[PDB]
Design a protein around this ligand. Structure first.
Ligand SMILES: [Ca+2]
Length: 190
């Protein structure tokens, strides 16, 4: 599929930003790897993310994942897509390219979802161990996630919810290859 390489998308987003945005599509949202996001991906994610944290249906935390992710899908699917209930990679780029000027509720809610998996006690901040534990549960290398935290945090011992939200915005927006927000999804390369 060369759609994402067409001149419209190259004028909208740099190659570097496009790679970052599509990484979130493939590594976090397109659970079955089909190349399109649909509700089935969220129904698989609910079960899999819950199990990755040691939860099972009937647990209060499972119900929280379920309710939150189904709300993220409700919002993501309410976008004007070619096919109802399916989100292409080309649609995804459009949805994230202006997150800094026009953030949508589903996008804020996903940011909160990840942060709240990490800050399980609601302290309002995360540390390296919590960050790396959650990305290890998502199947990423734990030591690389701890390295990512060091860069994300710019030396801080803990990162507040507001600082994480701003780092999340910087992941999608920044043109700088060393921007701290690049590291918010647990990797040190791009
Ligand atoms: Ca899919």
């Amino acid at each position: 599929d060369l759609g994402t390489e067409n001149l419209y998308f190259q004028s909208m987003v740099s190659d570097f930003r496009k790679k970052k945005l599509l990484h979130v599509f493939t590594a976090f949202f397109d659970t079955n790897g089909s190349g399109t996001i649909d509700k089935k991906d969220f129904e698989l994610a609910i079960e899999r993310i819950s199990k990755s944290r040691g939860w099972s249906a009937g647990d209060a935390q499972y119900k929280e994942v379920q309710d939150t992710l189904l709300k993220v899908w409700d919002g993501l699917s309410s976008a004007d897509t070619d096919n109802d209930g399916q989100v292409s990679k080309e649609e995804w780029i459009s949805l994230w390219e202006k997150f800094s000027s026009s953030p949508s509720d589903w996008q804020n809610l996903y940011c909160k979802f990840i942060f709240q998996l990490e800050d399980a006690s609601n302290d309002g901040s995360i540390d390296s161990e919590e960050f790396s534990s959650v990305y290890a549960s998502f199947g990423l290398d734990k030591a690389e996630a701890a390295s990512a935290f060091q860069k994300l945090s710019k030396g801080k011992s803990s990162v507040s919810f507001a600082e994480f939200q701003e780092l999340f915005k910087e992941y999608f927006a920044s043109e700088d290859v060393n921007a701290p927000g690049n590291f918010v999804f647990g990797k040190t390369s791009f």
